C-alpha cells in the first residue's frame, strides 16, 4: 500500500469536528490502523457541532467509533489522555504518522513549546523527535502573532501546518464538499489514496 499503515489521529477542541470525523472515516475505508485520541474540549465541540453521540470512556468510545465507521475489530484503537502505556507515548513504538485535526490554538502552543501535559501533546513531541510525519490542522481566525510564531517554529522543523481553509476551485455544493476538500489535502500530505479531490491539471498538456 501507499502511505502509512498506522495513523495517530488526535482531535482537539477547535471548531471543525466534522473534519476529524470525515478523516477518520476515510482512514478506515483505506484499511489503515488508527490510534484515536480526543481531548476533553474536543468532546464538547463534537457535542455542540454534530449529532454524533460519542461515549466518554475509551472502551465504549472504541466500540462506538468501530460501529460508526464500519471498521474492523481492532482497526481503531482508542487511548485515554494519560495512558502512557499506549504506543504514541514512546519513540520506541512502531512508526505512525500523526494528524491533529482539528488543532486548537492551545494544542498548537503545547506542541510548539514541547509541553507534554496529556497523551496528544506527548505523541506530537514523540513524532517530532523521531522525525515521523506530523500534520496540524489549525482552525482559528484571526491568527495572532502568537499562533503564527508557534506555527512557524513547527513548520521550520518539518511539521505540516495545514489550516482548515477549504478551496472552492471545484465548485462546492455543500458543507460536505468543503470538508472533503480539507480532508483530501490531509490524505494527499500523508500519501494515502483519495478520490474526492482530482489531480489539478493532470489532463492539461500545453497552454492555450
Ligand X SMILES: Cc1cc2c(cc1C)N(C[C@H](O)[C@H](O)[C@H](O)COP(=O)(O)O)c1[nH]c(=O)[nH]c(=O)c1N2
Ligand Y SMILES: CC(C)=CCOP(=O)(O)O
Show contacts with ligand Y in window 7-46 (CB under 6 A).
15
d(CA 188, CA 182): 10
Residue 40, helix vs strand vs coil: helix
4 contacts a second copy (rule: CB under 8 A): no
Question: Closest separation between CB of residue 82 and ligand Y, Å?
Answer: 11
Residue 63 binds what, of Na ion, ligand X, ligand Y, none (CB under 5 to 8 Å, by partner type)?
A: none
- Determine if residue 104 is labeled as part of a ligand binding site: yes
Which of 65, 89, 99, 111 is close enough to bind ligand Y by CB under 6 A? Answer: 89
d(CA 4, CA 12): 22
User: Sign of the C-alpha dihedral, residues 144, 150, 153, 154?
Assistant: negative
167 contacts ligand X (rule: CB under 6 A): yes
Q: Extract the C-alpha cell encoding 162.
A: 495545514
Identify the burial level of 130 via C-beta atoms within 10 angstroms of its C-beta, where 0-12 means exposed, 13-18 middle and 19 or more buried.
middle
- Determine if residue 106 is labeled as part of a ligand binding site: yes
185 contacts ligand X (rule: CB under 6 A): no
77's torsion region: left (phi>0), alpha (psi -120 to 50) or beta?
beta
Which of 7, 42, 112, 190 is close enough to bind ligand X by CB under 6 A? Answer: 42
State the DSSP H helix or E strand holding residue 38, giving kind and residue range, or none if neither. strand 33-38
171 contacts ligand Y (rule: CB under 6 A): no
Which of 8, 32, 138, 183 is close enough to bind a second copy by CB under 8 A? Answer: 138
117 contacts Na ion (rule: CB under 5 A): yes
Which of 7, 9, 14, 159 is close enough to bind ligand X by CB under 6 A? Answer: 14
- State phi, psi for 150 to the nearest 5 degrees: -70, -40
- Determine if residue 73 is labeled as part of a ligand binding site: no
CB 196 within 8 A of CB 183: yes
53 contacts a second copy (rule: CB under 8 A): no
Binding site for ligand Y (CB under 6 A): 15, 84, 89-92, 140, 167, 169, 200
From the annotation, which residues make up the binding site for FMNH2?
Answer: 13, 15, 39, 104-105, 107, 116, 139
From the annotation, which residues make up the binding site?
Answer: 13-15, 39, 104-107, 116, 139, 169, 185
Amino acid at each position: 500500500m501507499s502511505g502509512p499503515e498506522r495513523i495517530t489521529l488526535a482531535m482537539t477542541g477547535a471548531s471543525g469536528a466534522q473534519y476529524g470525523l470525515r478523516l477518520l472515516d476515510c482512514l478506515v475505508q483505506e484499511e489503515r490502523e488508527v490510534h484515536f485520541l480526543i481531548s476533553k474540549a474536543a468532546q464538547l465541540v463534537m457535542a455542540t457541532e454534530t449529532d454524533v453521540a460519542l461515549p466518554a470512556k475509551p472502551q465504549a468510545m472504541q466500540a462506538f467509533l468501530t460501529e460508526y465507521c464500519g471498521a474492523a475489530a481492532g482497526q481503531i484503537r482508542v487511548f485515554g489522555q494519560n495512558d502512557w502505556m499506549a504506543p504514541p507515548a514512546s519513540g520506541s513504538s512502531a512508526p505512525n504518522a500523526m494528524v491533529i485535526c482539528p488543532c486548537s490554538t492551545g494544542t498548537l502552543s503545547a506542541v510548539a513549546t514541547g509541553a507534554c501535559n496529556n497523551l496528544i501533546e506527548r505523541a506530537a513531541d514523540v513524532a517530532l523527535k523521531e522525525r515521523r510525519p506530523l500534520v496540524l490542522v489549525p482552525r482559528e481566525a484571526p491568527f495572532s502573532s502568537i499562533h503564527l510564531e508557534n506555527m512557524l517554529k513547527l513548520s521550520n522543523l518539518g511539521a505540516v501546518i495545514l489550516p482548515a481553509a477549504p478551496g472552492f476551485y471545484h465548485q462546492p455544493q455543500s458543507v460536505e464538499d468543503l470538508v472533503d476538500h480539507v480532508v483530501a489535502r490531509i490524505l494527499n500530505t500523508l500519501g494515502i489514496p483519495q478520490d474526492m479531490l482530482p489531480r489539478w491539471g493532470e489532463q492539461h498538456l500545453v497552454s492555450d
